């Protein structure tokens, strides 16, 4: 909190996880693909899309 | 009438190989070999049967 009241200048802050080598929150990680032609800039239409 | 693989072009994203060499019809027969000369230092263009 502290930390927000700051410049722009996004500054975080918080506690590691039990294993930092390993699998964090319950969340997710999704990749989105070309899958072919298309490309930096239809993919980023692409992404913003979703 | 060997290829040769000069480096690398870009297909749609997507690095591939690029080749010079002879176009089919001037390289199939030993007459043809009359066809490519070459510059010598003096820029006068020589011919292999020399």
Known sequence: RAFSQIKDAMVFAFNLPAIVELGTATGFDFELIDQAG?????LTQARNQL | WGGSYVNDFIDRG????VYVMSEAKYRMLPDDIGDWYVRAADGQMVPFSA
């Open chain 1, 38 to 42: 298309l490309g930096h800039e239809k």
């Open chain 2, 14 to 17: 997507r690095v591939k190989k």
